[PDB]
Amino acid sequence: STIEEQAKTFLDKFNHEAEDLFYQSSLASWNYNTNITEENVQNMNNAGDKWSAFLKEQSTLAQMYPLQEIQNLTVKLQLQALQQNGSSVLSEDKSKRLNTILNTMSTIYSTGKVCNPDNPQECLLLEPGLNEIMANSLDYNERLWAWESWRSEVGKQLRPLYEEYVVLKNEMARANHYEDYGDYWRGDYEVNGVDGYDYSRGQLIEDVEHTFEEIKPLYEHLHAYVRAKLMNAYPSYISPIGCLPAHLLGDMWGRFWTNLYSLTVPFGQKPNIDVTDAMVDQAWDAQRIFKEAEKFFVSVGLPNMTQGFWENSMLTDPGNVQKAVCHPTAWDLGKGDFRILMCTKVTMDDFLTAHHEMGHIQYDMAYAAQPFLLRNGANEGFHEAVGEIMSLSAATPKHLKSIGLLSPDFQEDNETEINFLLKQALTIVGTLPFTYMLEKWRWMVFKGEIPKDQWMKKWWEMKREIVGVVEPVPHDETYCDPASLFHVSNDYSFIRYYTRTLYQFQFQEALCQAAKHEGPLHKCDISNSTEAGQKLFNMLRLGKSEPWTLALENVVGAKNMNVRPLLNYFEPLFTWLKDQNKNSFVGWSTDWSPYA
Amino acid sequence: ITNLCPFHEVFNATTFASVYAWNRKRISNCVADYSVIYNFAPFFAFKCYGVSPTKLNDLCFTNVYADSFVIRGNEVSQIAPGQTGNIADYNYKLPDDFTGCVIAWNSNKLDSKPSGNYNYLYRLLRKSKLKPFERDISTEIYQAGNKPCNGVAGPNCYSPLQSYGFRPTYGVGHQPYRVVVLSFELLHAPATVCG
Ligand SMILES: *[C@@H]1O[C@H](CO)[C@@H](O[C@@H]2O[C@H](CO)[C@@H](O[C@@H]3O[C@H](CO)[C@@H](O)[C@H](O)[C@@H]3O)[C@H](O)[C@H]2NC(C)=O)[C@H](O)[C@H]1NC(C)=O
Ligand SMILES: *[C@@H]1O[C@H](CO)[C@@H](O)[C@H](O)[C@H]1NC(C)=O
Ligand SMILES: *[C@@H]1O[C@H](CO)[C@@H](O)[C@H](O)[C@H]1NC(C)=O
Ligand SMILES: *[C@@H]1O[C@H](CO)[C@@H](O)[C@H](O)[C@H]1NC(C)=O
Ligand SMILES: *[C@@H]1O[C@H](CO)[C@@H](O)[C@H](O)[C@H]1NC(C)=O
Ligand SMILES: *[C@@H]1O[C@H](CO)[C@@H](O)[C@H](O)[C@H]1NC(C)=O
Ligand SMILES: [Zn+2]
C-alpha cells in the first residue's frame, strides 16, 4: 500500500490506546487532587509514569514515516506532534543534569524564604505573607526591603543555574531543527502547508512588536494617571518625568496592577458593583451558582452539562476531614468525562470563575470528536480566551439585571463605567507591557543577542524603556531579576498571556457584532443571541484540526491578531484619560532613578 | 398457551460476548410475544425497519435470529441499514434489506467495573469489508506494511482486536450499551412462529 495508509492505521491504534491510558492518568490525578493521601499519590505516580512511557514508545515508533509522504492535512499534524521528539535527544548526562537544574530551580523558587532584617524570628515564604505585604502594605521602606530581599534571595542563587539552563536548552534546540529555544516555543504558532493561511515562527515577533506599537498610547496615558495617583499617595518617592519605581507597582514583579485600584480609584463616592450581599439575601449555593452559569451557555445555543458531570464534579468545598487543593480547574478526563474541581463559595468572583471554567468545559466538549492528539485548543491562547470572553460577558450589568441579582431601580452612570473600565484596565492593559518585555528579554537571551555579562543591564534598560519601570535599588550582574517570576523559574512560556489578551477582545468584538449590540463594547451581553453562539461553536468544534489562522478567520473575519478591538473596548477610558491628563505630563523619562 | 419464545434467554443472558464474535441464536417453533420485550428495561433505541412495530405480533415468520453484543453509545447508530462505520464494516453488518427491530439498552450497571471491562473486544483492522451477517473470530496480525508479519506484533504489525474499557464514570456515548438485533426471515416452510 502507501505509507499514508500505514500511518493512518498506526494513528488509529495509537489513538485508541492513548485514550484509555490518558483516562487512567487523568482519573489518578483527579483522585489525588480531590483526596490527598499516600495511596493516591502512589497511584498518580504510577499512572503518570505509564503514560509517559507509552508516549515515549509511540513517539519513537512514529519516526519511521517521513512527513514528506503524508498529504492528508491531518495525519501530517498528528505525526508531527508525535515526532516532536519528546524522547530527549540529549545525552544521558545532559538529560540528567537538565532535570537536576529544573528540579533545583523549582525547589529554590518554592522554598525561598525571606527573613526579617536582623530578626531571626520569622523567615517568610514568598506566597503566603510576602505577597500580601506587597499587595496591601503602604510602607515604602517595607516594600523596597521586601523587593530587594527577594531579589537577592532568589536571583543571586539562580543566576548560575539560569545560565546553565539557557545553555542546555539552547543545546537541545540546536539538536532539534529549531534555531533556538525561543524558536522552539514559537513553533506552536507556526502553520505550514496551507497556502493563504500560513504563519512563520519569526512572524510572531513582528506581530507582537506591531501590536505593542499600537497599544503604546493607551499604556502611556494610563501610566501618566497612575503616576499622578501614586505621587499623591507617596509624595517624595515618585518623580513626574521619571518612571515608576518597581516595588510600588502592586505585586512583586509588577505583572498586575489590580492592587492599585484603591489608590487610583477615580470616584470614591460611587460604590463598585458587587452581588455578594444580594446573593446571600436570595440564599444561593454553589450548585445553583453553577446552574445559573449553565443557563448562560444554554441561552447562547451551546449544549448543557452532563449528568455524569453533575454527579462526579465537586463544586463545593468538602471541608472537615477531607483535604483537597482549591485551585479551580476544568478537567477533560477523556471519553466523555468532564468535571470541575473548585471550592466555590457564594461570591461574585467565584460566580465569574465558575463561568470561566464552564467555558473551558464547553470548549473541551466541542473538540471531543477530533482525534486525541488534536484534542486541544488551536493555540495556547484560544482556550483561556474562550474562558475570558464568557467571564467578561457574565459580569455585565445587563446580564446581572436579567438574572435578577441587581435591582431594577439601579442605572449605570458615567462614573460606574469609568471605574469598571479603569479596574479592568489595570488588570488587562497593564500586564501587556510586562509580558512583552519578559518575552523580548527571554527571546533575545535564547538567541544570544544579550551577552551574559550584560543580562541584567539589558533587562533593566529594556524595562525602563518599555514598561516605564525603574529599579529602586541598583542591581549588578550577580542578581538575576527575571528568575524571581514563577514562569521564568519553572520554564513556562509567557507570550500566551499577550495572545490571550488580544484574542479575547477580538472574539468579543466579533460576537457583539453577531449579537447586534448598539453602544459601548463594555455593556455587551451575548446571552440570548444564538448567532454568536453558533459563530463561536464553529471554532470550538475544530480543535487543532484546522490552523489557528483559519479558526481566527472563522470567528473574527481576520487571519491575524489585531488590537483594534481592545482599543475600541477601552476608548471611553482613553477619552477620560485624555481629559484627566491635560495637567499631567504624558510619557516617561528614562534618566531618573530613585538612586542618585 | 402452548409455547412462549425464549425472549428471556436472548435478553437477560448476563453475558453478550463481543461484537466481533456475535451470538447467533435461532428462535423458532414458539409463540413470539413482544409484551415481555416491552416489559423489559426502557430502550435507548427501538427501531423497526422491515416489520412494523404494531404488526410485530400479527406477522409470522419461519425462523427468528437474535444477535446479542455490547457496543459503545456512538456505535449504536452504525448498526442500521445503509450506515458505514468501523463497527458496521469490520464487526457486524446489517443487510441492505434487513427486516426486524434493533433493540438497545444501557448496561453501565452490569458491564462497567472500576478496574475496567477489558473482556469485551472489537475489531478495527481488516483486509476487506464484511458481507452481511458474517462472523470472524480468527486473529491474524494485520500486515499493513509491505513485509510479512510472521504472526508476531511489531512495526506495521498490529493485532486486529482492540478492547473496550468500561468504567462507571464514563459519559453517555462511551458507556456500554447492550444491543440484541432481531432478524426475521421468511422461508419455504410452515412459519410455526406466530404472535
Ligand atoms: C484524511 O483522512 C481522514 C480519515 O482518516 C478523512 O476523514 C473523513 O472522515 C469522515 C468521518 O465522519 C468520513 O465521513 C464518513 O463518510 C461515510 C460515507 O459517506 C459516512 O457514512 C459517514 O457517516 C461519514 O460521514 C469521510 O469520508 C472521511 N474522508 C475521507 C476522504 O475518507 C479526511 O477527510 C482526510 N482528509 C483529506 C481529504 O485529506
Ligand atoms: C528525533 O531523533 C531521532 C534520533 O533519535 C531522529 O531520527 C528523528 O529524525 C528526530 N526527529 C525530529 C523531527 O527531530
Ligand atoms: C439539558 O440536557 C437534557 C439532557 O441531559 C435535555 O433533555 C434538556 O433539554 C437540556 N436543556 C434544558 C433546558 O434542560
Ligand atoms: C480518601 O481516600 C482514602 C483511601 O486512600 C479513603 O479511605 C478515604 O475515605 C478518602 N477520603 C478521605 C476524606 O480521606
Ligand atoms: C433572555 O430570554 C429570557 C426569556 O425568558 C428573558 O427572561 C431574558 O430577559 C432575556 N435576556 C436578555 C439579556 O435579553
Ligand atoms: C455624563 O457626563 C455629562 C457631562 O459632564 C454629565 O452632564 C452627565 O450628567 C453625566 N452622567 C452621569 C452623571 O453619569
Ligand atoms: Zn481559566
How many Cα neighbours within 13 Å face the side chain of A52? 9
Q: Judge whether A4 and A70 are in contact, CB under 8 Å.
A: yes
Q: Please state, in angstroms and rounded to a whole number, the distance separating the CA atoms of residues A143 and A149.
A: 10
- Distance (Å, whole) CA A60 – CA A80: 12
Q: Are B65 and B28 in contact (CB under 8 A)?
A: no
Question: Counting beta carbons within 10 angstroms of the beta carbon of residue A390, is it exposed (0 to 12), middle (13 to 18) or buried (19 or more)?
Answer: buried
Q: What is the per-residue burial (b if ≥16 Cβ within 10 Å, else e) of A561-582?
A: bbbebbbbbbebbbebbeebbe
CA-wise closest residue to A384 among A438, A344, A326, A428: A428
Q: Which DSSP state fits A320?
A: T
Place of cell 478496574: B115
Does the annotation flag A177 for ligand binding?
no
Inter-helix orientation angle A382-394/A286-299, to 10°: 100
Closest-lying ligand 4 atom to the alpha carbon of residue A37: 5
Q: What ranges do the domains of chain A cover?
A: 1-596
Ligand 3 lined by A308 (C-beta under 6 Å): no
Strand partners, A99: none
Q: Distances in Å between the alpha carbon of A430 and those of A208, A433, A563?
A: 16, 6, 14
The burial class, CB within 10 Å (0-12 / 13-18 / 19+), for B63 is: middle
Please report where in the chains the cell 463559595 appears, as a residue.
A345
* B122 chain-A contacts, CB cut-off 8 A: none
Quickly list H helices, chain B.
7-10, 35-39, 86-90, 108-111
Helix, strand, or coil (residue A504)? helix
DSSP letter at A451 equals: -
Chain B residue numbers with beta carbons less than 8 Å from the beta carbon of A338 are 171
Rounded-to-integer distance, Cα B47 and Cα B35, Å: 16
Closest ligand 6 atom to A415 CA: 14
DSSP state of A498: H
- Report d(CA B41, CA B108) in Å as an integer: 13
**Strand, helix or coil for residue B182:** strand
Residues near B58 by beta carbon (within 8 Å), at least 6 away in sequence: B195
CB–CB of B91/B20 below 8 Å? Answer: yes
* Cα–Cα nearest to A466, from A433, A442, A502, A444: A433
- Asked whether B58 and B51 are in contact (CB, 8 A), the reply is no
A522 marked as binding residue: no
Q: What does the CA dihedral B107, B113, B114, B120 come to, rounded to 10 degrees?
A: -100
Partner residue facing B172 (CB), from A13, A61, A336: A336
Backbone angles phi, psi at B79, to 5 degrees: -90, 80
Query: β-strand A329-334 against A337-341: which pairing, if any?
Result: antiparallel
Q: For A336, which of B146, B165, B174 is closest by C-beta distance?
A: B174
Q: Does B41 touch chain A (CB under 8 A)?
A: no
Cα separation, B97 vs B132, in Å, equals 10
How many Å apart are CA B77 and CA A136, to the nearest integer?
60
Distance CA A110, CA A489 (A): 10
Would the CB atoms of A308 and B172 count as touching at under 8 Å?
yes
Compute how many other C-beta atoms are within 10 angstroms of the C-beta atom of residue B6.
13
Residues in CB range of A142: below 8 A, 6 or more apart: A133
CA distance A71 to chain B (A): 18
What span, in angstroms and rounded, lies between the C-alpha atoms of A315 and A312? 9
For residue B14, give every residue at least 6 positions away whose Cβ sits within 8 Å of its Cβ, in sequence order, or none: B110
Burial letters for B82-113: b for 16+ Cβ neighbours within 10 Å, e otherwise?
eeeebbbbbbbbbeeebbbbbbbbbbbeebbe
The answer to whether residue B173 neighbours chain A at the CB level (below 8 Å) is yes
- For residue A408, with 0-12 CB atoms within 10 Å meaning exposed, 13-18 middle and 19 or more buried, which class applies? exposed
Query: Mutate which of B169, B170, B172 to disrupt the A interface (most A C-beta within 10 Å)?
Result: B169
Mutation choice for B interface testing from A14, A23, A332 by most B CBs within 10 A? A23
Q: Which residues contact A329 (CB under 8 A, 6 or more apart)?
A: A33, A340, A341, A342, A357
C-alpha cell belonging to residue A434: 510586562
Whole-number CA gyration radius for chain B = 18
| Unique residue bearing C-alpha cell 468501523 | B86
Contact A552, A320 (CB under 8 A): no
Instruction: Round to whole Å and give the CA distance between B20 and B10.
Output: 17
User: Phi first, then psi: what are they for A257, rounded to 5°?
Assistant: -105, 20
Q: Which member of B116, B124, B165 has the closest CB to residue A12?
A: B124
Four-way CATH pick for B7-127+162-185: 3.40.718.10, 3.20.20.80, 3.30.70.1840, 3.20.20.10: 3.30.70.1840
Rounded CA separation A403/A245 (Å): 43
Comparing CB atoms, the residue among B116, B124, B167 nearest residue A16 is B124
Q: Where are the alpha helices (DSSP H) in A35-139?
A: 38-62, 75-82, 92-111, 131-136
B177 vs A: CB within 8 A:
no
Residue B123 sits at φ, ψ, to 5 deg, of: -110, 135
User: Assign residue A592 a region: left if phi > 0, alpha if psi is -120 to 50, beta otherwise?
Assistant: beta
How many beta-carbon contacts under 8 Å exist across A and B? 51
- Residue B171 touches chain A, beta carbons under 8 Å: yes
Output the nine-digit C-alpha cell for A379: 493555540
A357 noted as active-site residue: yes
- The experimental method is cryo-EM
Give B168 to chain A, closest Cα distance, Å: 9
Give first-to-last CA distance, chain A, whole Å: 76
Whether A27 and B169 lie within 8 Å, measured CB to CB: yes
Question: What is the SS3 assignment for B173?
Answer: coil
Nearest-CA distance B144 → chain A (Å): 6
Q: Do B144 and A9 count as a contact with CB atoms less than 8 A apart?
A: yes
Measured CA to CA, the distance from residue A391 to residue A393 in angstroms comes to 6
Question: Is the C-beta atom of A35 inside 6 A of ligand 4?
Answer: yes
Taking contacts as CB-CB distances below 8 angstroms, the residues of chain B near A16 are 124, 162
**Which of A72, A73, A541 maximizes ligand 1 atoms within 8 Å of its Cβ, making it the mutation to test the pocket?**
A72
A487 is catalytic: yes
Partners of A14 on chain B (C-beta within 8 Å) are none
